[PDB]
Design a protein around this ligand. Structure first.
Ligand code: MG
Ligand code: MG
Ligand code: MG
Ligand code: MG
Ligand code: MG
Ligand code: MG
Ligand code: MG
Ligand code: MG
Ligand code: MG
Ligand code: MG
Ligand code: MG
Ligand code: MG
Ligand code: MG
Ligand code: MG
Ligand code: MG
Ligand code: MG
Ligand code: MG
Ligand code: MG
Ligand code: MG
Ligand code: MG
Lengths: 57, 185, 55, 141
RNA sequence: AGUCGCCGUGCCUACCAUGGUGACCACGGGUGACGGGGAAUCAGGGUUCGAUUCCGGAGAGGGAGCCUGAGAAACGGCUACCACAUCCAAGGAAGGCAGCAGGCGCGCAAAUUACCCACUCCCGACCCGGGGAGGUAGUGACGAAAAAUAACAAUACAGGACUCUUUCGAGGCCCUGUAAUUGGAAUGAGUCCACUUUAAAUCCUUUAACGAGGAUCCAUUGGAGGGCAAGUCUGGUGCCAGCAGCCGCGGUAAUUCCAGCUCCAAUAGCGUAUAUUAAAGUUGCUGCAGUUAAAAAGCUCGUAGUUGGAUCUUGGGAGCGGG
């Protein structure tokens, strides 16, 4: 039935980009400290515009 | 047929609404303050507290002048005063309902060694406890969640077999003095 | 536990404790070998110095 | 209104009994008709054999081809259609490959824009198709 | 009235009588039916499971009949028929793993032909002998408890709370983070002596000699339109490939596809499928509804069932204790 020739078109039609290395991130208990000292007091700008933690602009 | 036990219960409970944005702050707040690794450790304390709070809620529903109540009610007070959360001068069984999570977190060991000097940036405190540098009246402890009684808060110090508390230095400092004497020099 | 005499010991004492010290000795045949033979000796009847031979 | 006496229990208990069968879920479960007619014998998964590979068309507002397969079972002998979720993965399947199938998530009901499919393939040749997609493994040639 | 039976009884035999059960559900049929103590969920009331370590019952390939014995219709006792099945010199003989290990098949689906009678208990002619009952190691992310994967002090300032400052900016109480591993300290994972434990061994614990520079002793599973916590970033594709529990996305500027940075949640665990509880006051005793949304028999009588008016010794006292 139909035309099955065109399976895996896009997943084979895309280029092969490679990845990078940056670091390993802290794991376990230290990571929770990062979030605390980052979010609730790091530098505290009073006005946030209700802006998010990944808003790229 | 075997000689085994099979007895086991759980010690925590998950909430019903996973993403709420109002408690995630409180949870993560408690962590950075009292220095924990997971949400799970918090969830344990609420489970202890609810059950205390459950039982006392039932004794109140019983009448007064009932021997069960006069047995268990006087007994429960006695533990929380022993543990040092609840305070003498009030033993009424209705001041138990006004209890919070923070009282049972302050009463762990990690905090007391910190409030009692000795720790210097509380995350240090946990590392010391797990590195086996500390004792309680005779014995070393390798556990942060050890609830400390009130009878036994005047007897905490470094274990005796540590570099800190009167003992032999460690793997590094024992091979740098080696350099001062016969290695580098 | 302390005993009054060395002879009272092996009167009332477990053997495995005794053999800790070089005092008692124990025979060994692995107990699979042993009962294997025990299920033998039942296919031959009565013959004394045969069953003493154990085939 | 309601009966509401002090010694009415036989009536009420009875009334709830014969009147509970008019609920769809209870009726489905406690009668064997859905059960003996289910291709799976009250079970989650099942192995079976491939015998065709076809493409099913979709509903109106969408337009595509969803790359399903005709599959025969080992124990029962019945026949069914099944779906292969991912991009480019039908090519990973040969003829007569002894696959493992499962449900989709709606407990006998059709899902989405596919007209009459309620099974998805999971494992071909015992090497965990999802892992095979990600390149954590290859097939046992 | 008797026979048989360890004893009572239509349990059986002869002679008489015609009775016994039933809408308060007999009878018949189904059960993914061994029963119970109990298990999960649970405001209060309930719904579902219970083969599974304790008690009781039943069975030892399917059926029947027996010997011994205080006790068995035994099955690791016998004898026959059926189904299966091993030797064989072709005349004949031997068999029952739903006992411990192991194997074949079956299927979505389930461990070692290991060591010991040292513990617990049993049996015997017995302080002495036997026990795949039982203990002990092995496989084991069914599941449950504790708890690692970095800590610190100088170097700077993005900056902040404060002393000072018409601004920067000086003390830095105090903080964070990114780069320099700048700097030395502390630890165990991991090798390997020794002892202890053990029936004999292992593991735990105790303790000598080694043992970290953060390119390494490297934390994953899932997602980022909404429900629902988190990118209107970049390249490719063009109603094709594909996503999507539901609504929906894709027809050349895709917040949803294929990929890269970035971020979010749980964390040594996380996803997926299927049953089953709460949510379900969407099976309602507690506690729904019935004009038009699904819904009150066309009307009346009527047996079982359920439900049924008012009424018969009240005070006043007596021995007392309080405001
Ligand atoms: Mg068993
Ligand atoms: Mg059955
Ligand atoms: Mg049972
Ligand atoms: Mg029997
Ligand atoms: Mg059999
Ligand atoms: Mg028999
Ligand atoms: Mg038997
Ligand atoms: Mg047998
Ligand atoms: Mg077996
Ligand atoms: Mg399994
Ligand atoms: Mg666990
Ligand atoms: Mg993406
Ligand atoms: Mg979402
Ligand atoms: Mg339900
Ligand atoms: Mg409710
Ligand atoms: Mg309704
Ligand atoms: Mg429904
Ligand atoms: Mg109500
Ligand atoms: Mg109508
Ligand atoms: Mg009346």
């Amino acid at each position: 039935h139909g035309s099955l020739a065109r399976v895996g078109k896009v997943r084979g039609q895309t280029l092969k980009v490679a990845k990078q290395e940056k670091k390993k991130k802290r794991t376990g208990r230290a990571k929770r400290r990062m979030q605390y000292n980052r979010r609730f007091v790091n530098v505290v700008p009073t006005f946030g515009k209700k802006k998010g933690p990944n808003a790229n602009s | 047929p075997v000689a085994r036990s099979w007895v086991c219960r759980k010690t925590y409970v998950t909430p019903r609404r996973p993403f709420e944005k109002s408690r995630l702050d409180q949870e993560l707040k408690l962590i950075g303050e009292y220095g924990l690794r997971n949400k799970r450790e918090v969830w344990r304390v609420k489970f202890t507290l609810a059950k205390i709070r459950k039982a006392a809620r039932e004794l109140l529903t019983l009448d007064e002048k009932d021997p069960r109540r006069l047995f268990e009610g006087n007994a429960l007070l006695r533990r929380l005063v022993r543990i040092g959360v609840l305070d003498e001068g009030k033993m009424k069984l209705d001041y138990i309902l006004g209890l919070k999570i923070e009282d049972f977190l302050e009463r762990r060991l990690q905090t007391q060694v910190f409030k009692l000097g000795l720790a210097k940036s509380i995350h240090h405190a946990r590392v010391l406890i797990r590195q086996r540098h500390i004792r309680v009246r005779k014995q070393v402890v390798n556990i942060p969640s050890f609830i400390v009684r009130l009878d036994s808060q005047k007897h905490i110090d470094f274990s005796l077999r540590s570099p800190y508390g009167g003992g032999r230095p460690g793997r590094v400092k024992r091979k740098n003095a080696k350099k001062g004497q016969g290695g580098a020099g | 536990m302390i005993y009054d005499s060395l002879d009272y010991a092996k009167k009332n004492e477990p053997k495995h404790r005794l053999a800790r010290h070089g005092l008692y000795e124990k025979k060994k045949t692995s107990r699979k070998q042993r009962k294997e033979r025990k299920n033998r000796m039942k296919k031959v009847r009565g013959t004394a110095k045969a069953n003493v031979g154990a085939g | 209104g309601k009966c509401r006496g002090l010694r009415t229990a036989r009536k009420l208990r009875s009334h709830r009994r014969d009147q509970k069968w008019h609920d769809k879920q209870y009726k489905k479960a406690h009668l064997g008709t859905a059960l003996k007619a289910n291709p799976f014998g009250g079970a989650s998964h099942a192995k079976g054999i491939v015998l065709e590979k076809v493409g099913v068309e979709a509903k109106q507002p969408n337009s595509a081809i969803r790359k399903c397969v005709r599959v025969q079972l080992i124990k029962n002998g019945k026949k069914i259609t099944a779906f292969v979720p991912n991009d480019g993965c039908l090519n990973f399947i040969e003829e007569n490959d002894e696959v493992l199938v499962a449900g989709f998530g709606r407990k006998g009901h059709a899902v989405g824009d596919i007209p009459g499919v309620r099974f998805k393939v999971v494992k071909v040749a015992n090497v965990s198709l999802l892992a095979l997609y990600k390149g954590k493994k290859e097939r046992p040639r």
